[PDB]
């Protein structure tokens, strides 16, 4: 009954507040604790910190000096801000409810007790990268097609991850395979998406891609064909 | 940090050590979590798991000080293949800021799969601009590993290949992309480019040519 | 603050060499002297000798008899007052088992009496003579150091292995005394009843005055370690659940008040629980 | 050697452990019964016994 989704700027220059945002879907925001997690590329998972549901903050002391962990209670929106952003504070930056658990093993009454937190229900992540790089959006050229057909597109030279790409606007689902993306020696990822379909599909059913690449804000789509 | 290895049959049962050994009564927390997706949380108290968790993952709950904390598996199948945390709060320690090492499963025995592989040439609108791209699409191959080769007509060519990285798919399988880029008079001129996949003894190759 | 983890420079098995230490002390044994530096609390004043972990102080019957040619008087009226003309007398060779019990404040697995409750002293008139309470129901107390701990042997002289508080395997907890709350308020509404007697007024019960820490608390000896307990949830006088009272260790003590002799406990390993009876009291009267 | 595990104490060097005869006597009121069976297997029945103080 509650999901998450998270929202960020997709690139930040270094020595630069990120900002990201969650929105709770399903129930009051202003009714249980929230934590932040982001995984880099080597490092483990590392917890960021967490605001609990009276909106206390508490902040990972390997950062504690640079996170702000805000909250919108009007809006079920949750918040973070991370100053003096560097190359290693790329990641994908996770938000989750955590679960107060109360380990009691002595007294109550003597404070034989301890708080454990356990987060249950995460956002699906926010990809964000560190580069004094610009932006820059894609260019999809279509894959013609020649028992089964499969065509595609090539999704070329593009920066910084991710891209969103999908068949006849979420009509075609089956069948499809979007590659993981290749990093050129330019310096701009390059990515390419498929589709296995019937050899006589193609008497005129329109087969139509979808890009999005939201760090340049640059959606297109394209047709395939012969 | 730094990551344990740990090798299980398919079907057997894996037991995950915990990293740490506690000093208080405890209160263990259990993630799954593999690269590039959302961790999932396995089990909460020290044996305690939510819905949508099945049985066959066990804890060891926390009776008697002396206990140590293990992830039990049961029935490990492909999809088990992940990094395991092992949150260990207890009295004595402070504040479990760390998730602490981590302990990647690899389900052994699997069963082999072949690439299938498919070659686009060089698009119309892309060649009007002067640049030309062919892309090879490796995928539903295990284990992860494949070796990508561009014969251009018989000669191979290996200056202009960008070979992305085996990676796992939603079937438990791995696909990788490759990408020839050449200017498009050297993609007119010659015969046909080739694009050879080989996968564990075997290779294939699907080859195109410029018409 | 509870306990600490102290270290300290030991002399070894030979007499030039010196190792560094490491011990856990009760904060009640230790003074802070004039950056975290402490100090035993009674070496200023004192001369301190460790137990002979070997002997125990369990309390066993002792039966006291008097030489021949002479004789031991005993009374058996159940309302004796302590003072004065008994009837019924009887002699014996030798007086019944008497158990040295070394409590305060609370009288622990003593005589019961047969009827009533005999309050006894010398002139009840002025307030410093002490009201000793007898009791026919005996609550029932419960006392446990629930700490795990270990003893671990230092070498500090030739033949000289003085035993320190090790480790605390397990988890931290606090030591203390438990109480049924509808037995211990029923029983001390029954000594209420009985002062008001030879007081016709109402009478009151507060806590101990204040001082040294032996008088505030209710001292004793349990599995082999000196608990120090506070007794305020005991006595505070308001004419089902259980009472539970904060409890203290030491292991520098010094019983028999003597002019400058400390002793040490050597520590018991594992986990001390003693149930005992409270069968009396030892109350004292405000002017 | 023995600073491990012991105290020492040094003989005042005046004493000394030369062997001389001890006599063993019982208090009034009690007697010592001797044995002079010149077979004596140490235990169990000798005759000829007699008295000492
Ligand atoms: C002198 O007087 C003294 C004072 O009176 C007295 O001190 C007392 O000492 C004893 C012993 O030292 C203390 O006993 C301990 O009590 C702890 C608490 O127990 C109560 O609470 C739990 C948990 O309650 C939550 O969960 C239940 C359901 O799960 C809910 O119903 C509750 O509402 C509550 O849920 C809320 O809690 C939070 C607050 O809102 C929220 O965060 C949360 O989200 C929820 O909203 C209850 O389950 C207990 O129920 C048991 O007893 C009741 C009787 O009332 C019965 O229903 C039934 O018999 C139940 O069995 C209870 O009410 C215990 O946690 C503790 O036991 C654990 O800890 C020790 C030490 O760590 C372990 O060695 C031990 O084995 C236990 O470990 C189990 O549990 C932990 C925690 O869950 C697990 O992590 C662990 O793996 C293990 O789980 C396994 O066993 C479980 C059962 O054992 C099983 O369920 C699991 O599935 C798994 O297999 C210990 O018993 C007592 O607290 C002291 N007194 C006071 C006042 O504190 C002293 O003894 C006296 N005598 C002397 C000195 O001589
Ligand atoms: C009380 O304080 C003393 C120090 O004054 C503590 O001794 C220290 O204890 C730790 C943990 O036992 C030792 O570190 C450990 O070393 C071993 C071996 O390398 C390793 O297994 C651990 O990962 C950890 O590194 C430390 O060496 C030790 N110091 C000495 C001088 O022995 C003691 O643990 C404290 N105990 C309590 C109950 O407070
Ligand atoms: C008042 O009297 C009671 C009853 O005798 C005392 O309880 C006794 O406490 C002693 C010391 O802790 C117990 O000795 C222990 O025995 C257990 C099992 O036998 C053993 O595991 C320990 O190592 C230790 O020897 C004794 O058992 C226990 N008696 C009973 C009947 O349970 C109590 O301590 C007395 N109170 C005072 C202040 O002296
Ligand atoms: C209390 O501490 C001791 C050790 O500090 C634990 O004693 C163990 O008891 C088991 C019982 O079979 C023995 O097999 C072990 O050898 C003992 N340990 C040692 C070091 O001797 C005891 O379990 C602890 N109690 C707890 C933690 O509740
Ligand atoms: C006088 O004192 C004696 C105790 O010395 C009491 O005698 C006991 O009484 C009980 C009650 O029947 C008997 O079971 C015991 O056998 C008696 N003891 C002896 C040694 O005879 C006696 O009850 C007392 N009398 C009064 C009036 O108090
Ligand atoms: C604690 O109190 C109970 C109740 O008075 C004692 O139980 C009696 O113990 C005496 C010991 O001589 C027995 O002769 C009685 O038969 C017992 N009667 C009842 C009703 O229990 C118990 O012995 C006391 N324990 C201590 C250590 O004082
Ligand atoms: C019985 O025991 C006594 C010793 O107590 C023996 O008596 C001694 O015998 C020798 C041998 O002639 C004498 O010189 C001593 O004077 C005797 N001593 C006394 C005190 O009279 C005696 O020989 C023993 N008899 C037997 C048969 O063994
Ligand atoms: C013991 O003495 C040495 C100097 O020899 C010093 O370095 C050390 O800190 C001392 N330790 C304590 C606990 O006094
Ligand atoms: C000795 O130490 C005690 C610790 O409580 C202190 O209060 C007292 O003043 C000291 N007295 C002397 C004579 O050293
Ligand atoms: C015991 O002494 C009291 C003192 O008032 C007396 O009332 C009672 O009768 C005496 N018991 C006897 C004589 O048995
Ligand atoms: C104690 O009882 C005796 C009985 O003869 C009585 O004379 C005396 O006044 C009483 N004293 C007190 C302090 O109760
Ligand atoms: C104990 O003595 C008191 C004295 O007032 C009395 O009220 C109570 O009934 C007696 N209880 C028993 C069990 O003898
Ligand atoms: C005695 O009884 C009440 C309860 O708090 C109060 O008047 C007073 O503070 C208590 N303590 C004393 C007089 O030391
Ligand atoms: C005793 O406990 C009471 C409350 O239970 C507390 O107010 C008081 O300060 C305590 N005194 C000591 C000496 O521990
Ligand atoms: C003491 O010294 C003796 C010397 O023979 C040695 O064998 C023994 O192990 C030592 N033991 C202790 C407890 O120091
Ligand atoms: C001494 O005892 C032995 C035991 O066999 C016996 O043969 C011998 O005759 C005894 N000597 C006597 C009685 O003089």
């Known amino acids: 009954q509650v999901q998450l989704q998270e929202s960020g700027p997709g690139l930040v220059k270094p020595s630069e507040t990120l900002s990201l945002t969650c929105t709770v879907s399903?129930?009051?925001?202003?009714?249980?604790?929230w934590s932040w997690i982001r995984q880099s590329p080597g490092k483990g998972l590392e917890w960021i910190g967490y605001i609990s549901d009276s909106e206390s903050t508490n902040y990972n002391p390997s950062l504690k000096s640079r996170v702000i962990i805000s909250v919108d209670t009007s809006k079920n929106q949750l918040s973070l801000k991370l100053n003096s952003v560097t190359a290693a504070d790329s990641a994908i930056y996770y938000c989750?409810?955590?679960?107060?658990?109360?380990?009691?093993?002595?007294?109550?009454?003597?404070?034989?007790?301890?708080?454990?937190?356990?987060?249950?229900?995460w956002g699906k992540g926010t990809t964000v990268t560190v580069s004094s790089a610009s932006t820059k959006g894609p260019s999809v050229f279509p894959l013609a097609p020649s028992g089964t057909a499969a065509l595609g597109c090539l999704v070329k030279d593009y920066f910084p991850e991710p891209v969103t790409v999908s068949w006849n606007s979420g009509a075609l689902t089956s069948g499809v395979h979007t590659f993981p993306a290749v990093l050129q020696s330019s310096g701009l990822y390059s990515l390419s998406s498929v589709v296995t379909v019937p050899s006589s599909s193609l008497g005129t059913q329109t087969y139509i891609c979808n890009v999005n690449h939201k760090p340049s804000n640059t959606k297109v789509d394209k047709k395939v064909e012969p | 940090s730094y990551v344990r290895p740990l090798s299980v049959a398919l079907g057997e049962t894996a037991s995950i050590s915990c990293g740490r050994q506690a000093l208080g009564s405890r209160a263990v927390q259990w993630y799954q979590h593999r690269p590039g997706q959302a961790p999932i949380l396995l089990i909460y108290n020290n044996q305690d798991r939510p819905s949508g968790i099945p049985e066959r993952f066990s804890g060891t709950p926390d009776i008697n000080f002396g206990t140590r904390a293990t992830l039990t598996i049961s029935g490990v199948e492909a999809g088990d293949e992940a990094d395991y945390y092992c949150h260990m709060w207890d009295s004595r320690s402070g504040f479990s800021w760390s998730f602490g090492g981590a302990t990647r499963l690899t389900v052994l025995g699997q069963p082999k799969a072949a690439p299938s592989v498919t070659l686009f040439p060089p698009s119309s609108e892309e060649l009007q601009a002067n640049k030309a791209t062919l892309v090879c699409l490796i995928s539903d191959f295990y284990p992860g590993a494949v070796t990508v080769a561009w014969k251009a007509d018989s000669s191979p060519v290996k200056a202009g290949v960008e070979t992305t990285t085996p990676s796992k798919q939603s079937n438990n399988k791995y696909a990788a992309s490759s990408y020839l880029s050449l200017t498009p008079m050297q993609w007119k001129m010659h015969k046909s480019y080739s694009c050879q996949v080989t996968h564990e003894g075997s290779t294939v190759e699907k080859t195109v040519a410029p018409t | 603050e509870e306990i600490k983890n102290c270290s300290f420079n030991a002399t070894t098995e030979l007499r030039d060499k010196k190792r560094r230490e490491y011990a856990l002390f009760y904060r009640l044994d230790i003074v802070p002297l004039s950056n975290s530096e402490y100090r035993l609390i009674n070496c200023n004043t004192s001369v301190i000798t460790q137990i002979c972990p070997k002997v125990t102080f369990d309390p066993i019957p002792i039966h006291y008899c008097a030489p021949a040619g002479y004789a031991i008087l005993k009374c058996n009226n159940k309302t004796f007052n302590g003072t004065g003309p008994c009837n019924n007398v009887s002699t014996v060779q030798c007086t019944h088992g008497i158990k040295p019990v070394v409590s305060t404040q609370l009288l622990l697995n003593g005589s019961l009496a047969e009827e009533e409750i005999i309050i006894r002293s010398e002139n009840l008139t002025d307030n410093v003579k002490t009201i000793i309470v007898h009791l026919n129901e005996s609550v029932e107390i419960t006392c446990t150091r629930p700490n795990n701990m270990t003893r671990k042997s230092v070498r500090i002289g030739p033949g000289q292995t003085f035993y320190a508080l090790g480790d605390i395997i397990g988890d931290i907890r606090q030591p203390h005394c438990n109480i049924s709350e509808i037995k211990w308020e029923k029983t001390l509404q029954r000594v209420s009843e009985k002062l008001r007697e030879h007081f016709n007024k109402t009478i009151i019960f507060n806590q101990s005055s204040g001082g040294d820490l032996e008088i505030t608390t209710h001292s004793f000896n349990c599995g082999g370690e000196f608990f120090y307990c506070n007794t305020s949830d005991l006595f505070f006088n308001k004419t089902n659940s259980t009472i539970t009272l904060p409890c203290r260790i030491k292991q520098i003590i010094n019983m028999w008040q003597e002019v400058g002799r400390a002793m040490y406990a050597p520590p018991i390993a594992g986990n001390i629980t003693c149930k005992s009876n409270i069968t009396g009291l030892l109350l004292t009267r405000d002017g | 050697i023995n600073c491990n595990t012991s105290v020492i104490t040094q003989i005042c060097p005046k004493v000394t452990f030369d062997p001389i005869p001890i006599h063993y006597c019982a208090p009034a009121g009690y007697a010592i019964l001797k044995c002079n069976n010149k077979t004596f297997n140490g235990t169990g029945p000798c005759n000829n016994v007699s008295t000492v103080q």
């Open positions: 989750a409810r955590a679960q107060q658990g109360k380990r009691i093993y002595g007294m109550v009454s003597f404070g034989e007790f301890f708080y454990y937190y356990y987060m249950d229900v």
């Open positions: 399903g129930g009051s925001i202003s009714n249980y604790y």
